[PDB]
Design a protein around this ligand. Sequence first.
Ligand code: CA
Length: 340
Amino acid sequence: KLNAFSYMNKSDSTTLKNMAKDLKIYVTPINMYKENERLYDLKQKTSLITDDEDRLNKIEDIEDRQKKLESINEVFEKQAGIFFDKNYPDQSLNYSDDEKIFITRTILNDRDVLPANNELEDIVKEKRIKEAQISLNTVLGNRDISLESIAAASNFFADKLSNILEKNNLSFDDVLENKHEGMEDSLKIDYYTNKLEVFRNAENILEDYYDVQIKELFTDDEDYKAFNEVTDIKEKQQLIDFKTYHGTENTIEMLETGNFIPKYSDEDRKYITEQVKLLQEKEFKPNKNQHDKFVFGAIQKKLLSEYDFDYSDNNDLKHLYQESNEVGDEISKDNIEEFY
Ligand SMILES: [Ca+2]
């Protein structure tokens, strides 16, 4: 069949090799997508350094790499174009250059045979999911990718702004009128301001990243389109959260059947609630013993292993309550009310 270097000149073949050498990375459409985000985020921190010597050299140290990512991209674009005319000519106008490149590269190194019109639609779904993950995980850092996390992230910087502005007695309109141009904090003021946008963007990415997932939850392609028009982003998150608690299979049946389903048995449900009470009860025991620390962890470990209950998550607990209320498990429902 075909291999990675199909439709690729030897001049291009050599470029990829040379580049990966100085770039010190394994060249892949996604890996390039990653570095680009990493480098974008980098250029912004550069501005702050202060030592004009560093910022000057550092800024060019990046401009060089970005120039490399591109000349690597030009190579991929050529290979993809050829690849499509040769193999998927009727579909060549149905996808974007980036999309094509991704598909082209995946077929060569990660596929036996060829997708085939219909199958070529699915592979793009893969990139759409991969790309979002990488972006959100990068900017959030140790925040778990979630609407609540994104909010928490921008608020951290919103606060950083309000405070730095008060420090200089500058207003929101002042910074809009560029009153801060010649201050020491200016660069910081702009940095924060930009970070706010960074997370406005993340919020959009997330919505797309969800949309693609939620599409797989609806069997009725039409029923989906309808649901999509009435719901906002917050409502969409509640579904994702709801999905990760009941798993995909169940969740799918739930919204098309319209009937509720319990993740746990009545017995198990009772057990879990009781344990939750044990942890909270032993969560404020002053000067905890080594055992008290072990028992605390021993219970969590069991809960998660045996039942699939993530006390840390706190989403499992939220939907547990929802479950109890729905089936009318007063016992458990009551235990959870005592907890909250
Ligand atoms: Ca879970």
